[model samples]
Target: RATYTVIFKNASGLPNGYDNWGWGCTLSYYGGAMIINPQEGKYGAVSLKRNSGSFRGGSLRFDMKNEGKVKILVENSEADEKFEVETISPSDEYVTYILDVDFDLPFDRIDFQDAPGNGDRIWIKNLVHSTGSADDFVDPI
Candidate 1:
């Protein structure tokens, strides 16, 4: 994942710490909604500007307006540590999705995703992630 230095807003309209990698994001980076188009070979996630220790929190919630499925992931690939939710997006009605991290272990990343090929122009707003631990799939060409 390539890191970029840019600013965006959170639910309260303050400077947020979220980062998206391998995602061709928006001209609206410092605004309300992030118009994200998943690149062919990239990763997407909400990160805490590289904090210390592990994420010990409740859940991650956001409003995603989309057509296809969007998955919530928490992972540590190098350690072979992975955990994910079976529930994805739905209805294309600007749904608010709540992701509860399932791992009890420390040290992980929270990656939000869907297939790049099938991923449509997605709108993400009011992104809320409380520090948490993690836990991917498929080929997109």
Candidate 2:
């Protein structure tokens, strides 16, 4: 399946409006399949990635504010719509999410939520694809 990866780069400061925290991620899958599968298995419905310089109690959250056109395929498809990414732990390393997509979906913008509104940071890398298994999983992983 085609895929795209995103990394948050030392993202600081919250945008105007909204009580949300952290940074936003705007990804574009062009015209191919997109997959989002993490290696740790499914746990929550949404995937969270910790950025660099995060503290022990520091955490990050992901919200599906804008599904864009990806949902059209996820909600009405027969393939899995989610993937495992990274999680917020005591480790101070940044991680990203992988989306295993089956159809070509173009995403112009996606957002992330942060908390405290203090010294928060993040970085967004790029989308990538690799060999993996094919199976459908339930939502809210």
Candidate 3:
């Protein structure tokens, strides 16, 4: 089992293992928050690619906030399979999200999308992905 944590303390561009997509959004680090400016009608997404091609399933945890929604997309490159999980309502304050994901094929990449609206401001604290047992999950400190 393995675990990966992405902390945006000094992030300027994409995080250690991430790629950026979409337009009109800016990713900046402001002390504790990973500020994401999802400008009007444009989505901001960050993707993490798995090069080993051995991931089968895992738990995803993150802290996010905005007056809009957030979506988590898990994709399998070789098989072209995709799975998505979305928030139900607008998160105005920092909230932690923990999701259990299971896939038949190996995971290739994980994408995080900040919903676009009338230029809503989004903030992400951290993201943790664990392939360890469910009981091993822990809240970010």
Tell me the tens digit of each residue's lDDT in model 2 across 92-125: 3333444443333322222322222222333333
Instruction: Put down candidate 1 lDDT per residue, 18-112, tens digits, no spaces.
Output: 33332433223434666555554453434223233345344556667755566666655347565675457555677765565556665335555
Cα lDDT of all candidates, in order? Answer: 0.47, 0.25, 0.65
Clashing pairs in 3: none
- TM-score for each predicted model, relative to the true structure: 0.58, 0.24, 0.72
Off by over 4 Å in 2: 1-91, 99-107, 128-141
Query: For residue 47, what is the lDDT in candidate 2?
Result: 26
The per-residue C-alpha lDDT of model 3 at residue 55 equals 57
Model 3 root mean square deviation, Cα atoms = 3.2
> What TM-score number comes out for model 3?
0.72
TM-score, prediction 2: 0.24
Q: Quote model 1's TM-score.
A: 0.58
Better of 1 and 3 by lDDT: 3
Clash totals, every prediction = 4, 38, 0
Q: Between prediction 1 and prediction 2, which has the larger TM-score? A: 1
